[PDB]
Amino acid sequence: MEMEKEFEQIDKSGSWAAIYQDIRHEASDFPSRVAKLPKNKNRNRYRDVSPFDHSRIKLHQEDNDYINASLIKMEEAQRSYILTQGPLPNTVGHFWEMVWEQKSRGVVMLNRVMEKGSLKCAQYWPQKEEKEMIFEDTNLKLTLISEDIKSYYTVRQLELENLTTQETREILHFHYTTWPDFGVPESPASFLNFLFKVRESGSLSPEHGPVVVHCSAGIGRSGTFCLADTCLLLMDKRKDPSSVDIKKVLLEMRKFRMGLIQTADQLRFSYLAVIEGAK
Numbered sequence: 175m176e177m178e179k180e181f182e183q184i185d186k187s188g189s190w191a192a193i194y195q196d197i198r199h200e201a202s203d204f205p206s207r208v209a210k211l212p213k214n215k216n217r218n219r220y221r222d223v224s225p226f227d228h229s230r231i232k233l234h235q236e237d238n239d240y241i242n243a244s245l246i247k248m249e250e251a252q253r254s255y256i257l258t259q260g261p262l263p264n265t266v267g268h269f270w271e272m273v274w275e276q277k278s279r280g281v282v283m284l285n286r287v288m289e290k291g292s293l294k295c296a297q298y299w300p301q302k303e304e305k306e307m308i309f310e311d312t313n314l315k316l317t318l319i320s321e322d323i324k325s326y327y328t329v330r331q332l333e334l335e336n337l338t339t340q341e342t343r344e345i346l347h348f349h350y351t352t353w354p355d356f357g358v359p360e361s362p363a364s365f366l367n368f369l370f371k372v373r374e375s376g377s378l379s380p381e382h383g384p385v386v387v388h389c390s391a392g393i394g395r396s397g398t399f400c401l402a403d404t405c406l407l408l409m410d411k412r413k414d415p416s417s418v419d420i421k422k423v424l425l426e427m428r429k430f431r432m433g434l435i436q437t438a439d440q441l442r443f444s445y446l447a448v449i450e451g452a453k
């Protein structure tokens with residue numbers, strides 16, 4: 175059923191809440207035993223948001239390999255994403271270790287450091303060229319190279335150096351800066367343009383490791399980003415773009431990380447992003 179028609183049918187009936195709860199009811203449930211170990215309590219921002227054991231990203235150290243991050247692997251779309259929480263004061267070094275070990279080219283950030291008067295994630299990148307950051311626990315150095323600030327998003331060029339081998343890589347930081355404190359954007363125009371800037375970059379492409387995407391919890395706004403990307407590209411691939419069932423793509427993605435899409439408004443916005451994106 176053409177999603178644009180399904181959309182108007184849900185909107186006229188005002189049943190967004192009922193569709194959304196159907197997804198919550200049918201969603202996968204897998205063990206998260208490593209996340210709940212007592213040694214990992216300060217590695218988790220929220221007690222009710224954990225990566226599944228089967229799909230969690232492992233840090234390449236013998237000490238403690240745990241980070242709140244998941245590999246979403248979409249087989250038919252031929253895309254991979256890592257979805258992770260906003261780094262904490264004690265996980266900033268782990269975050270950049272993961273970016274290094276997984277060979278990511280891009281980081282996508284969908285939140286502000288402060289929202290609603292509270293801290294939503296650590297200040298994990300350098301704000302001035304001449305004041306670089308060093309993560310002593312993971313032996314990495316991070317330098318701001320350049321910054322391009324636009325109305326809806328900022329793009330930063332960063333240099334990440336493995337102080338152990340003295341190899342360097344260029345990482346692109348794509349920061350969406352205008353998601354509102356409450357609700358969802360009124361129009362997806364600026365979200366879609368942000369998405370096609372990340373694609374243009376090569377960050378989503380198979381010659382690199384998976385893109386790292388995050389918000390505060392790594393399930394809401396992060397969910398919207400990878401659902402829209404995957405749904406649009408399936409439409410570019412299949413002989414019938416109307417066969418693309420957004421609810422079925424979301425349940426497939428929810429086999430890899432719990433809670434993706436947090437509200438009925440985010441589900442509606444995702445439809446609006448794919449519907450408008452198809453034009």
Ligand SMILES: CC(=O)Nc1ccccc1C(=O)NN
Pocket residue numbers: 363366367370450451452453
């Ligand atoms: C399929 C589609 O409409 N993509 C976009 C959406 C919104 C803004 C830009 C683009 C784009 O294509 N950029 N190169």
